[PDB]
Nucleic acid binder design. Structure first.
Lengths: 114, 79, 177
RNA sequence: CUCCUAAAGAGUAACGGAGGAGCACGAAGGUUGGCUAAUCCUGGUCGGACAUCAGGAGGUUAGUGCAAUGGCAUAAGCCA
RNA sequence: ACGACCAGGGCUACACACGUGCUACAAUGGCGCAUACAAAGAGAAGCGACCUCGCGAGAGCAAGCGGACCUCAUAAAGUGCGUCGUAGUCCGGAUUGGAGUCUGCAACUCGACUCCAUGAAGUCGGAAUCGCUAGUAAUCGUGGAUCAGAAUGCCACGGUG
């Protein structure tokens, strides 16, 4: 159905359906299903509404939703406004973690232009 | 990414910073220790960090604590 | 007529003293709620505009009014008189039964809710805000969705200034960021 | 065909100054009922200088199948 | 001084072009649990078990081993069961944010690794072009040199074939 994470997860195995939330991967999905009491191989259908309310109550413990997007934007903005090395690498769309820029920077640089 | 057994700072820079804060506002601090960590007692001072040829003036703010000094002095020129 | 009854008994006498009105007729009112759906791209195909208006028909239970282009402008390459979008105006209790349907159901549904703005006033006491998603309403089912078109909602009030305007919807517990 | 030259009735020439027509429409005709613009500002999903929505300003600066002139709110304009 | 010492920086840049590789685009596959079968090597400022703590990288304690004895060291493809059911997906892992570990005087430029989160391109590749004839190609792991740390490279080893 729908979760406190607005997003609407698909009707499939709960462990994989909960991954559709921004901020919930496989490990956090397994942890949510374990702390809630729901099996991992059960679909989102066949789940009572009282069980979806339980899943919402558990996902409320994590910062996983536009809130997390806001915290990531804030960190990158702090880097850019600080003017440090990583801030400059973020400003110019260049690799931030020491990767080579002579070749192979296509994820940060995008499609090549002559 | 240094262990959690305490941050690193060069001793000469540490003593320079204590002498600068105990003696009131001073001139920019000329240093070559780009690897030193910015500590909270350096907030307010402007440290001139070497970048290879010059000493780049870096006015320290509370948002810089935890960074290394060389993070605010680029070493390569690109236009 | 929930908030309609809640209007004439509760929000009038708190507002009557809040602005020190001499007559009850000085308190602001809510005339109409008009929902606009500017399709814009229906010129490519008009099969999508009817079902687009079919959604707006389910949000308020009223058959929409297809608006036509007032004048040709080529900047969006349309001829005057083309079916460009639909709209519905709501008055009376159908406005009220819709006015609570969003403030109590339309508010707690929008993705990444952060609250409405207090600056989105006309300058003479009329509020307008736009919702980006149409699947926020209980009526429109998620299963039947051909597109994710939003719509604008404006609130026509007899208020004279924005202060009297914001004071009225605040009495209805409007989310003000 | 329209304006100016044309000398405040009409008319008035030049290889004088400027523009149009050789159609269109069974509704764009008749009648009854209703309606009132341009532009701009403010607010508002995509939406942008410019689309649709709401409000204010404004008062015909709009509109009239087409040139110009004279008209047009009782509308001759717009809708059924 | 074109000699010598030092600190910091650079050799790691980045519109772009090429060579050589690794990982993929998936179902002859991904994931989960269970389980089978190697060879060749290295080790004393070294390899470091067992046990305890940690989600993990690792940490503490502390045997044995100059080694057919001890350690690295759990081979992996495979096989059994379950699931996914052709979707940019339970494919793919780039990139980025946060939190850490270890080496090292010191991980900013510019290390490796771990955890959480995110999830680019990519759905088999134009002209053209390469290797390979049998335990070969293809594919799957393992070890060593250099080395404080830093292998998708190099050199070697076996499995299926």
């Amino acid at each position: 159905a729908r979760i406190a994470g607005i997003n609407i997860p698909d009707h499939k195995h709960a462990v994989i359906a909960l991954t559709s939330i921004y901020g919930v991967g496989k490990t956090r999905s397994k942890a949510i299903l374990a702390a809630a009491g729901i099996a991992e191989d059960v679909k989102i259908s066949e789940l009572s509404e009282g069980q979806i309310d339980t899943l919402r109550d558990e996902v409320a413990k994590f910062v996983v939703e536009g809130d997390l997007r806001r915290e990531i934007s804030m960190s990158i903005k702090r880097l850019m406004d600080l003017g440090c090395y990583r801030g400059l690498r973020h400003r110019r769309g260049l690799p931030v973690r020491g990767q080579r820029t002579k070749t192979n920077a296509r994820t940060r640089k995008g499609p090549r232009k002559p | 990414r240094s262990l959690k057994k305490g941050p690193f700072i060069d001793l000469h820079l540490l003593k320079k910073v204590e002498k600068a804060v105990e003696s009131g506002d001073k001139k920019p601090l000329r240093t070559w220790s780009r690897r030193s960590t910015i500590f909270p007692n350096m907030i307010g001072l402007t440290i001139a960090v070497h970048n290879g040829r010059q000493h780049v003036p870096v006015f320290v703010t509370d948002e810089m604590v935890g960074h290394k000094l060389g993070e605010f002095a680029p070493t390569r020129t690109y236009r | 007529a929930k908030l309609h009854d809640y209007y004439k008994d509760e929000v009038v006498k708190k507002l009557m003293t809040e602005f020190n009105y001499n007559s009850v007729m000085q308190v602001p009112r809510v005339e109409k709620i008009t929902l606009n759906m500017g399709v814009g791209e229906a010129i490519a195909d008009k099969k999508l505009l009817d079902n687009a208006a079919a959604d707006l028909a389910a949000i308020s239970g009223q058959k929409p009014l297809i608006t036509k282009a007032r004048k040709s402008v080529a900047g969006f390459k349309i001829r005057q008189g083309y079916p460009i979008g639909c709209k519905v105006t709501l008055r009376g209790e159908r406005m009220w039964e819709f006015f609570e349907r969003l403030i109590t159901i339309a508010v707690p549904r929008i993705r990444d809710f952060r609250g409405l703005s207090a600056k989105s006033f006309d300058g003479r006491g009329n509020y307008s805000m736009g919702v980006r998603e149409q699947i926020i309403f209980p009526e429109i089912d998620y299963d039947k969705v051909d597109r994710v078109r939003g719509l604008d909602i404006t609130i026509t009030t007899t208020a004279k200034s924005d202060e009297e305007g914001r004071a009225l919807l605040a009495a209805f517990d409007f989310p003000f960021r």
